[PDB]
């Protein structure tokens, strides 16, 4: 059941990331905006 | 001051007697940095 764990291995963290990709229609932002979004995501993950 | 029991510091080099050479502020989360020389250097020697 788990000896051949090729198909039974999928743990993508998306619960805290789904809104951040749903809000953006395209996501083509600048470097400052990308860095701010990354810092906000890191802070949210730390304070979860 | 009305009394010395409110806020008294026993320090020979009291900062009160020295003139204020800069301002104190908190950047975003509260990063205490004395960032005054960089924005106060300027030129102020030609246009005036």
């Amino acid at each position: 059941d788990q000896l051949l764990g090729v198909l039974l291995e999928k743990a993508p963290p998306l619960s805290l990331l789904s809104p951040i990709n749903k809000f953006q229609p395209e996501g083509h932002l600048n470097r400052v905006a990308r860095a701010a979004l990354l810092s906000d995501l890191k802070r949210r993950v730390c304070a979860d | 001051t009305r009394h010395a029991g409110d806020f008294s510091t026993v320090s020979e080099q009291d900062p009160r007697q020295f003139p204020p050479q800069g301002i104190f502020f908190y950047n975003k989360d509260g990063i205490l940095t004395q960032l005054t020389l960089r924005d106060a250097m300027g030129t102020i020697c030609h246009s005036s």
Binding site: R31, V32, A35, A36, L38, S39 | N27, R38, M41, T43
Partner: protein, 48 residues
């Protein structure tokens, strides 16, 4: 201005601070601007 030997030193001193400055040949004509450098996740700089 005729004191080139001191104006060059003043320009070097004011360029060693790390702010924006023209190129080595001193392009006083045209619209030449310094290349944009990398920046930390702190926001956007502005004049004062």
């Amino acid at each position: 201005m005729l004191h080139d030997n001191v104006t060059e030193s003043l320009r070097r001193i004011t360029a060693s601070g790390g702010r924006l400055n023209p190129t080595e040949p001193l392009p006083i004509f045209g619209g030449l601007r310094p290349a944009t450098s990398a920046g930390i996740a702190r926001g956007q700089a502005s004049v004062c």
